[PDB]
């Protein structure tokens, strides 16, 4: 089983979506969840450290999800940190670019709690958690 | 006789007919309470015994302790079968 004290960073431009994701994570047993409004704030909070999983939106102001993922992978201290990508449009080119950047998973809005739980379980199994 | 007992294990109904006669519907309509209808059978002749409407024997009327009864007299055989057929 995955560690229930794992710290999650939810990054999205909409506060309501972040609250929904936090509630879904709480229903799954994860209570250590922090929220970020854009890529810059997400990177600033990542520089603090202590996070074990990232859920980030694709299109965000001042930094999109792809650039944030590239910056995370470029950092040695956070290159192995799993990142979950949530988007509104599942274009093949964007998915391929994210996979080349090192995305751990992909979620398409709208989605159900079952899909999110399945994605989290698959990511944890791939990482051996 | 196994199949014989098998079929015997079925309840059946026996019918005794007092007599038979033929009349027109007009005469039937002329019948009221107290009307008299004659039968083709002579008084005292054995009455027809029927199983599910099939005549198989003849019998005579007796009274048993307070109940009517039929005394078996004679059965049928193709001879009587044909005989009654012709009759």
């Amino acid at each position: 089983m995955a560690d229930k004290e794992l710290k999650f960073l939810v990054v999205d431009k909409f506060s309501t979506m972040r609250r929904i994701v936090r509630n879904l994570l709480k229903e799954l047993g994860f209570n250590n969840v922090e929220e970020a409004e854009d890529g810059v704030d997400a990177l600033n909070k990542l520089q603090a450290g202590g996070f074990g999983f990232i859920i980030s939106d694709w299109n965000m102001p001042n930094m999109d999800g792809l650039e944030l993922l590239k910056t995370i992978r470029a950092d040695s201290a956070m290159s192995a940190l799993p990142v979950l990508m949530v988007t509104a449009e599942a274009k093949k080119e964007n998915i391929i670019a994210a996979a080349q950047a090192g995305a751990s998973g992909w979620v398409v809005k709208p989605f159900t709690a079952a899909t999110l739980e399945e994605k989290l379980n698959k990511i944890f199994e791939k990482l051996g958690m | 006789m196994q199949d014989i007992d098998l079929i015997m294990d079925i309840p059946v109904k026996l019918t005794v007919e007092l007599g038979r006669t033929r009349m027109t519907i007009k005469e039937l309509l002329r019948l009221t309470q107290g009307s008299v209808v004659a039968l083709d059978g002579l008084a005292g002749e054995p009455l027809d015994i029927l199983i599910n409407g099939y005549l198989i024997a003849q019998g005579e009327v007796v009274v048993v302790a307070d109940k009517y009864g039929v005394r078996i007299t004679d059965i049928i055989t193709p001879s009587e079968r044909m005989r009654r057929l012709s009759r």
């Binding site: 309501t16 509104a88 992909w106 | -």
Partner: protein, 301 residues
């Protein structure tokens, strides 16, 4: 636009009893509910045709019965959740509008060609979108109320709108059994869906009414039919059984019963006559015309 499976492909008879299951489930088919849903479907299709100036195609899905938590787990988020009341039944009903259907309706109402679908970003619905949802919900509630009239006249009243299932609180426990009826709506090349979920406890008093597939009756024709049926049944025969008394004993004493053994029994003041084990009257026993006879005293009312 890759589906979830395509994205994954590219990236890569004895059961224990759990008392937390509320096993009061209806294994019988709710035909009447199916007829109501079909009628509701048609009445709404019309309403949507009137509102959107386009011809909609509404398909009624299977009426799946499942616990509330499973229903909540399969609801896409974010979504438009509307709480309704089905008077005089007790409880709160849910009318679920998917964001795709809301976006399609907004497109049709505001001159959208339909060639540019709007992708759900997870944002809250705007006030104009809220008013559109309002209008759609009013039409749906009117259609539902009209559909329910033929079987049981019910008044449908809207309560409030929510965006998350946790705020609905329509069931006491997450394991409670609810009845959900999915609907698929097709408008041009755009497809939308909406769901009507009703807790089973709300419709539990109407269980028998919902069971059989009923309709087309009468008041005088049915009266004559019932009268003649009652007349016909009166000629049926029954086996009247009268019990002399009852003796409490043990099986060992039965094995020791032999010819001549006398068993003491309490003398009954009255004899109870039973039809297939059901008592019908009390009487005294006697002999008439050489046969045992019963003199009726009272009829069991």
């Amino acid at each position: 636009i890759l589906s979830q499976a395509e994205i994954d492909a590219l990236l890569n008879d004895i059961r224990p009893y759990d008392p937390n299951t509320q096993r009061r489930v209806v294994r019988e088919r709710l035909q009447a509910l199916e007829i109501i849903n079909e009628r509701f479907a048609r009445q709404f299709r019309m309403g949507l045709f009137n509102l959107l100036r386009r011809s909609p195609d509404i398909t009624v899905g299977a009426i799946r019965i499942q616990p509330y938590h499973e229903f909540a787990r399969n609801l896409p988020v974010p979504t438009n959740l509307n709480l309704i009341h089905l008077k005089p039944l007790r409880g709160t009903g849910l009318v679920v509008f998917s964001p795709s259907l809301v976006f399609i309706a907004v497109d049709n109402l505001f001159g959208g060609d339909g060639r540019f679908p709007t992708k759900v970003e997870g944002r809250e619905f705007t006030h104009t979108e809220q008013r559109v949802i309002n209008r759609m919900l009013k039409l749906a509630l009117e259609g539902y109320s009209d559909a329910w009239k033929a079987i049981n006249p019910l008044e449908v009243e809207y309560v409030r709108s929510e965006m998350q299932v946790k705020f609905t609180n329509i069931t006491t426990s997450p394991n409670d059994i609810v009845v959900n009826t999915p609907f698929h709506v097709e408008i041009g090349n755009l497809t939308g869906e909406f769901n009507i979920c009703l807790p089973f406890s709300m419709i539990e008093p109407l269980r028998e009414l919902l069971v059989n597939p009923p309709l087309e009756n009468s008041r005088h024709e049915d009266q004559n039919w019932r009268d003649n049926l009652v007349r016909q049944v009166q000629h049926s025969e029954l086996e009247l059984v009268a019990n002399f008394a009852d003796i409490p004993l043990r099986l060992s004493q039965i094995l020791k019963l032999k010819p001549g053994d006398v068993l003491p029994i309490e003398k009954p003041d009255r004899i109870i006559a039973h039809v297939d084990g059901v008592p019908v009257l009390t009487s005294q026993y006697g002999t008439v015309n050489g046969q045992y006879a019963l003199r009726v005293e009272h009829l069991i009312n």
